[PDB]
């Protein structure tokens, strides 16, 4: 399935899923992953917070992982959402995650790609809050969580 | 070492449709990456609500009218969305089908799919109403292909 029919209610925040694989004309797969930071319905991300994730994973998730096709949040807003080229692998997509998320916890420098002419909304961002969500998930502890059914 | 703060946000015109970047997978399948931009950067931003509901809509729309979609997901900054595609580049066509998506997001009275506890991380931040008009906002204006003008 392109697409699993997650039902919400049933998984355990914060975890690493396999949302979908999709097969390519040639054989080869893009793998789709669930990076669940919040407990869905239980509160979501700030819109400023979430766009500072954005910019920092899109770096460190590269800087772990090999074959990143677009690191996005989600519409919910309690977590963020990977497309990878490559087979279904959550245990390393979870190492990878974890290894991003403490380089996100300790990101102390200015935030990358934030200005006019980087970014489509420069006055929107919140690196104290992005942290403190990457610290909130170490210190939760991430796991695979299997795609519950609806 | 992040392909999108190489783009010139202040030189785009939204709205419009743009190749953001094409991959390889090993065996030489092409993953066309798009910037699907409905507001001008810096010049205001999309409600989270809003946009949340943009993502179901667009999410079964485009489908409808492109194959070999991966999925389009929001922005963080709230002015647009990425969809990567399984197939060679193709602007031209990736903006027909925004268009008839669009269509059939400004005119989408049904209730919003996939909205409710079990079927949504946060099922109460939606507004049909502000997503139609976007929608609406974006055709009224008119689409074209953006190109990508680099720093
Ligand atoms: C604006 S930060 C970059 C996010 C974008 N979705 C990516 O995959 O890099
Ligand atoms: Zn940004
Ligand atoms: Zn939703």
Redesign the pocket.
């Known amino acids: 399935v392109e697409s699993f029919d997650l039902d919400h209610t049933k998984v355990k925040a914060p975890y690493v899923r396999l949302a979908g694989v999709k097969t390519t004309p040639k054989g080869d797969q893009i793998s789709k992953y669930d990076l669940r930071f919040l407990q869905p319905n239980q509160g979501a991300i700030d819109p400023a917070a979430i766009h500072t994730l954005?910019?920092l994973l899109?770096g460190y998730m590269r800087d772990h992982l090999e074959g990143?096709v677009?690191?996005?949040p989600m519409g919910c807003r309690t977590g963020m959402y990977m497309a990878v080229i490559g087979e279904p692998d959550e245990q390393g997509v979870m190492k990878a995650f974890e290894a991003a998320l403490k380089d996100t916890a300790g990101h102390d420098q200015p935030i990358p790609?934030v200005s006019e002419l980087e970014?489509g909304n420069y006055r929107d961002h919140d690196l104290a809050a992005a942290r403190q969500h990457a610290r909130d998930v170490l210190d939760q502890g991430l796991k695979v969580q299997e795609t519950i059914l609806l």
Do not use: Q
């Open positions: 954005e910019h899109a990143v677009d690191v996005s790609g970014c």
